[PDB]
């Protein structure tokens, strides 16, 4: 179906402990495929998925160069942000950046993304038009003005419509056995007595990929949204994800509860019961 590529950068200042650390990671959908860490003994863009390993030395050296340059830019941006927010050089701060393109099944750009945060708060974002900006605050408006003046959006649009989509298409092909394979959840319901008149029904989804999944409990065919404990989808470490949804049910009423599982790897949503 649809796919995405994302790059995420985190630049973390640490006054008195050297230059800000810069860590970048790249994802296709929910699969990390590259990393860079400026604190590594020998910093390089490094593969983190098998299907990227085939990329040649020009790719790796180019990515490494780009990451080192990006680290420098974001170290500068950290210094700039201090100014824009009237902040001390003594504090630790963080810039995060996301870039992304989403494509449809035919590989055509659905939309592009480029967003920035400072200390975990939205700073500036490229709008969906890939032409204009939304600045979160008056500091970011300074950046906006600079980026409007320099027609930065055009360069970003060029990347997002062009290389991002093209390289995503390539990765999708090279990694098709995994990137284009949904692993449906392995589902089951467990029962955990809490007391003589209540038990937890926990609906498990395991081993699924991609991460997007909907687990819902119904009681008498009514969604138990407010009464469901839903843990964050979590990585198993083998590429797949896990999630559970639990409801506390009256003893003997277990059959009034149905767990509903929606996942792209399922031809139809599953209904489960204890």
């Amino acid at each position: 179906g649809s796919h995405s590529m994302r790059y995420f950068y985190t630049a973390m200042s640490r006054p008195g402990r050297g230059e800000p650390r810069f860590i970048a990671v790249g994802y296709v959908d929910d699969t990390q495929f590259v990393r860079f860490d400026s604190d590594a003994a020998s910093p390089r863009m490094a593969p983190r998925a098998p299907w990227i390993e085939q990329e040649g030395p020009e790719y790796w050296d180019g990515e490494t160069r780009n990451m080192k340059a990006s680290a420098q830019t974001y170290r500068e941006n950290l210094r700039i942000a201090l100014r824009y927010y009237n902040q001390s050089e003594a504090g630790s701060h963080i810039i995060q950046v996301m870039y992304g393109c989403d494509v449809g099944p035919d590989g055509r750009l659905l939309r592009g993304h480029n967003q920035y945060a400072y200390d975990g708060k939205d700073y500036i974002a490229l709008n969906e038009d890939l032409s204009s900006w939304t600045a979160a605050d008056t500091a970011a408006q300074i950046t906006q003005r600079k980026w409007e003046a320099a027609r930065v959006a055009e360069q970003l649009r060029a990347y997002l419509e062009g290389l991002c989509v093209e390289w995503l298409r390539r990765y999708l092909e090279n990694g098709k056995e995994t990137l284009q394979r949904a692993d449906p959840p392995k589902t089951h319901v467990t029962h955990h007595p809490i007391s003589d008149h209540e038990a937890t029904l926990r609906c498990w989804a395991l081993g699924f990929y991609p991460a997007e999944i909907t687990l819902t409990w119904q009681r008498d065919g009514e969604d138990q949204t407010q009464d469901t404990e839903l843990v964050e989808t979590r990585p198993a470490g083998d590429r797949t994800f896990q999630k559970w949804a639990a409801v506390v049910v009256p003893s003997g009423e277990e059959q009034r509860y149905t767990c509903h599982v929606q996942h792209e790897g399922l031809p139809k949503p599953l209904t489960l019961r204890w």
Binding site: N66, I80, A150, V152
Partner: peptide, 9 residues
């Protein structure tokens, strides 16, 4: 591939 769009804030 990572973007080369390096813009100072």
């Amino acid at each position: 591939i990572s973007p080369r769009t390096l813009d100072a804030w």
